[PDB]
Scaffold this active site. Structure first.
Site, PDB file in Angstrom:
ATOM      1  N   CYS A 154       3.840   0.958   9.372  1.00 34.62           N
ATOM      2  CA  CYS A 154       3.757  -0.141   8.680  1.00 34.62           C
ATOM      3  C   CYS A 154       5.249  -0.534   7.933  1.00 34.62           C
ATOM      4  O   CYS A 154       6.020   0.354   7.932  1.00 34.62           O
ATOM      5  CB  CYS A 154       2.913   0.061   7.556  1.00 34.62           C
ATOM      6  SG  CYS A 154       1.048   0.370   8.057  1.00 34.62           S
ATOM      7  N   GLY A 171       2.956   5.588  10.671  1.00 36.59           N
ATOM      8  CA  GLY A 171       4.312   5.555   9.970  1.00 36.59           C
ATOM      9  C   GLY A 171       4.941   4.075  10.332  1.00 36.59           C
ATOM     10  O   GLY A 171       6.114   4.196  10.195  1.00 36.59           O
ATOM     11  N   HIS A 183       0.861  -1.130   0.130  1.00 42.15           N
ATOM     12  CA  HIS A 183       0.082  -0.053   0.031  1.00 42.15           C
ATOM     13  C   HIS A 183       0.816   1.185   0.008  1.00 42.15           C
ATOM     14  O   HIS A 183       0.356   2.438  -0.112  1.00 42.15           O
ATOM     15  CB  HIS A 183      -0.891   0.138   1.132  1.00 42.15           C
ATOM     16  CG  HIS A 183      -0.680  -0.020   2.578  1.00 42.15           C
ATOM     17  ND1 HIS A 183       0.636   0.741   2.912  1.00 42.15           N
ATOM     18  CD2 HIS A 183      -1.143  -0.634   3.546  1.00 42.15           C
ATOM     19  CE1 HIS A 183       0.865   0.636   4.091  1.00 42.15           C
ATOM     20  NE2 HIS A 183      -0.338  -0.392   4.733  1.00 42.15           N
TER      21      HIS A 183
HETATM   22  C1  LIG Z   1       0.755   2.087   8.714  1.00 39.27           C
HETATM   23  C2  LIG Z   1       0.738   3.123   7.496  1.00 39.27           C
HETATM   24  C3  LIG Z   1       2.117   3.676   7.039  1.00 39.27           C
HETATM   25  O1  LIG Z   1       3.201   3.618   7.675  1.00 39.27           O
HETATM   26  O2  LIG Z   1       2.115   4.517   6.044  1.00 39.27           O
HETATM   27  C4  LIG Z   1       2.167   5.862   6.109  1.00 39.27           C
HETATM   28  C5  LIG Z   1       2.270   6.517   4.988  1.00 39.27           C
HETATM   29  C6  LIG Z   1      -0.799   2.275   9.356  1.00 39.27           C
HETATM   30  C7  LIG Z   1      -0.587   1.595  10.915  1.00 39.27           C
HETATM   31  C8  LIG Z   1      -1.522   2.253  11.754  1.00 39.27           C
HETATM   32  C9  LIG Z   1      -1.724   3.592  11.984  1.00 39.27           C
HETATM   33  C10 LIG Z   1      -2.278   3.915  13.177  1.00 39.27           C
HETATM   34  N1  LIG Z   1      -1.910   2.756  14.080  1.00 39.27           N
HETATM   35  C11 LIG Z   1      -1.499   1.823  13.317  1.00 39.27           C
HETATM   36  O3  LIG Z   1      -1.314   0.625  13.684  1.00 39.27           O
HETATM   37  N2  LIG Z   1      -1.755   1.433   8.734  1.00 39.27           N
HETATM   38  C12 LIG Z   1      -2.707   2.211   8.222  1.00 39.27           C
HETATM   39  O4  LIG Z   1      -3.078   3.334   8.347  1.00 39.27           O
HETATM   40  C13 LIG Z   1      -3.713   1.296   7.529  1.00 39.27           C
HETATM   41  C14 LIG Z   1      -3.115   1.502   6.041  1.00 39.27           C
HETATM   42  C15 LIG Z   1      -3.808   1.348   4.854  1.00 39.27           C
HETATM   43  C16 LIG Z   1      -4.656   2.663   4.089  1.00 39.27           C
HETATM   44  C17 LIG Z   1      -5.255   2.209   2.904  1.00 39.27           C
HETATM   45  C18 LIG Z   1      -5.523   0.759   2.424  1.00 39.27           C
HETATM   46  F1  LIG Z   1      -6.156   0.599   1.442  1.00 39.27           F
HETATM   47  C19 LIG Z   1      -4.762  -0.325   3.078  1.00 39.27           C
HETATM   48  C20 LIG Z   1      -3.989  -0.067   4.509  1.00 39.27           C
HETATM   49  N3  LIG Z   1      -4.895   2.036   7.376  1.00 39.27           N
HETATM   50  C21 LIG Z   1      -5.724   1.877   8.669  1.00 39.27           C
HETATM   51  O5  LIG Z   1      -5.319   0.971   9.570  1.00 39.27           O
HETATM   52  C22 LIG Z   1      -7.175   2.578   9.036  1.00 39.27           C
HETATM   53  N4  LIG Z   1      -7.324   2.016  10.608  1.00 39.27           N
HETATM   54  C23 LIG Z   1      -8.172   2.364   8.004  1.00 39.27           C
HETATM   55  C24 LIG Z   1      -8.722   0.635   8.128  1.00 39.27           C
HETATM   56  C25 LIG Z   1      -7.889  -0.302   6.856  1.00 39.27           C
HETATM   57  C26 LIG Z   1      -8.386  -1.765   7.066  1.00 39.27           C
HETATM   58  C27 LIG Z   1      -9.190  -2.221   8.088  1.00 39.27           C
HETATM   59  C28 LIG Z   1      -9.879  -1.391   9.005  1.00 39.27           C
HETATM   60  C29 LIG Z   1      -9.513   0.121   9.227  1.00 39.27           C
END
Ligand SMILES: *[C@@H](CC(=O)OCC)[C@H](C[C@@H]1CCNC1=O)NC(=O)[C@H](Cc1ccc(F)cc1)NC(=O)[C@H](N)Cc1ccccc1
Ligand SMILES: *[C@@H](CC(=O)OCC)[C@H](C[C@@H]1CCNC1=O)NC(=O)[C@H](Cc1ccc(F)cc1)NC(=O)[C@H](N)Cc1ccccc1
Lengths: 305, 305
Positions: free
Chosen positions: B145, B143, B41
């Site tokens: 992931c 940040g 992603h």
């Molecule tokens: C990691 C995102 C990252 O590092 O990139 C930054 C540019 C995030 C970890 C989360 C943030 C808050 N606490 C955590 O553990 N992951 C996300 O934000 C995840 C990313 C994503 C966005 C769009 C997509 F199509 C797929 C994946 N988004 C979320 O976790 C939100 N809660 C939304 C969500 C997505 C799937 C199921 C339920 C909620």
């Protein structure tokens, strides 16, 4: 989101651990620049730990009686000296992996990470707190002495603890990197006991904040209290007294949550007298006190190193 | 003596963490030899996250769109491929710090260490368990992931988890390093919830053995039960059923303590029906289920790496 007991990354400290042998006694050492630090009790004979005169034991020992090993590489000892209860072995090779470091003496209530090591090799890393009675509740086996505790500020590793012994109570005691023991403990085989261990009130409050930041709110009430009416209840339960410095240090957390310290203090007073009623906070059925306000802010803000 | 939630030393993994940037989105990647692995992603903003067609976005991207940063140095991407939910960026330089490693898919109930990272730099390390509902109870901010979970089996780092998402309930979900999600989850912003979570019975028993090894014996009774009798009560409290394989996995801890597994089960049965008598076990007021039998053996025998 979420909240866990989080240690610092151990890499910078892994690269300083070495194995130190004197006779048949082997333990861990800390190799910074051209100096290897370890507990002086490594020079003790088997029947020397009862009434040891380390000053005199060191005279009898040659540099050649100290075998240091970094990996499977032998570091030649070219000097040996004693600062308080820590032995300092001068070696002929400077550690290429020496990090920016400082030696710090921590206070009761402050936390740190421990890299548990055996024969100079790491086993694991966990987070500890210096208890108000100057002990730590660690995980140490025979061969763990010389393992160090530390914090990391950006790129600086502040070493704060070196492990020396285990009290009969299962608790642990040690020194700073200058050889001064934390608490009234000494490295002689004598009857030594820790005073009553009290709960670190400012940490429980930081912990409750962290709980608030993460959505746990069932404990928040509308009552309030004064610093003296809370401390009256506190001291009955072997809780450390709360001071204005504690109220201030929680400012940041109070300013991120909008909750006044004294407001949270009232919620805490209710939990001390009445318990939790089979409920939990951040997955715990106890009041956790090994998280400092900084640890909370660190884990709820993403501080990297 | 002592028992803490102990993570693996994180040094070997710290040296593989890098920063991957595509457009406005930055996250962490894992740099092993000449390949950087990271969540796919990274090629998504917050517009296509509805029905993200990662197949088109991948082809529509070029090697130059991916900025990879190992500390200060920049790594030139010379190829890109997709393996399920993980992006594979081939770079022109192989990581000199690459450990002996393997990619493994862990089973529910098994634990691992998480190295939480932000912008390619580690923030902390903590121990997690794959819950029976294929989530983990982690600590992750925006940040994070690309952060990875791992075990160290001898000299081999076994990568088992890469972090992708947080569910609205506050638990976390991610993939193995082959890009296959643990659980019925998908890397897209569509409605997703985990099944009911159960307690990892085999881990609770291991933890009770840890308590015995460390002198905590108050909860031991003289009784013994049957596997079927224990499971009848286990189900009443939302505990995983105990299988003969679990019984065998606990063999080493039963051998060290002299307490038969079915004897320990009778003690756990009594704790579940009558509670923990306001007492703590290994510093906890709840029955802990995130220590595997192997976690217990390595902490209580001082296994090193
Ligand atoms: C990691 C995102 C990252 O590092 O990139 C930054 C540019 C995030 C970890 C989360 C943030 C808050 N606490 C955590 O553990 N992951 C996300 O934000 C995840 C990313 C994503 C966005 C769009 C997509 F199509 C797929 C994946 N988004 C979320 O976790 C939100 N809660 C939304 C969500 C997505 C799937 C199921 C339920 C909620
Ligand atoms: C580390 C010793 C080491 O690694 O080198 C030899 C292998 C030991 C760590 C202990 C072992 C078990 N869990 C721990 O935390 N330290 C000791 O074994 C310590 C050594 C010592 C003996 C005599 C002294 F005067 C100072 C230091 N011995 C103990 O901790 C014993 N519990 C005995 C004891 C000593 C002082 C006070 C109370 C009990």
């Amino acid at each position: 989101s979420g909240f866990r007991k989080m240690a610092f990354p151990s890499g910078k400290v892994e690269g300083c651990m070495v194995q130190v042998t004197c006779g048949t006694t082997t333990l861990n050492g800390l190799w910074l620049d051209d100096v290897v630090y370890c507990p002086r009790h490594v020079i003790c004979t088997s029947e020397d730990m009862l009434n040891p005169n380390y000053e005199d034991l060191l005279i009898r020992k040659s540099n050649h009686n100290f075998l240091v090993q970094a990996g499977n590489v032998q570091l030649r000892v070219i000097g040996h000296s004693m600062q308080n209860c820590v032995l300092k072995l001068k070696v002929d090779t400077a550690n290429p992996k020496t990090p920016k470091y400082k030696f710090v003496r921590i206070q009761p209530g402050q936390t740190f990470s421990v890299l548990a090591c055996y024969n100079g090799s790491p086993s694991g890393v966990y987070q500890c707190a210096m208890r108000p009675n100057f002990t730590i509740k660690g995980s140490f086996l025979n061969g763990s002495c010389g393992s160090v505790g530390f914090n990391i500020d950006y790129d600086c590793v502040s070493f704060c603890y070196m492990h020396h012994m285990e009290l009969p109570t299962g608790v642990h005691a040690g020194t700073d990197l200058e050889g001064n023991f934390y608490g009234p403990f000494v490295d002689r085989q004598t009857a030594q006991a820790a005073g009553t261990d009290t709960t670190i009130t400012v940490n429980v409050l930081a912990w409750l904040y962290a709980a608030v930041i993460n959505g746990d709110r069932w404990f928040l009430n509308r009552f309030t209290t004064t610093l003296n009416d809370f401390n009256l209840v506190a001291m009955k339960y072997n809780y450390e007294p709360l001071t204005q410095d504690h109220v201030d240090i929680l400012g940041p957390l109070s300013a991120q949550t909008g909750i006044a310290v004294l407001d949270m203090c009232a919620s805490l007073k209710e939990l001390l007298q009445n318990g939790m009623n089979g409920r939990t906070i951040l997955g715990s059925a106890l009041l956790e006190d090994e998280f400092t306000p900084f640890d909370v802010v660190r884990q709820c803000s993403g501080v990297t190193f």
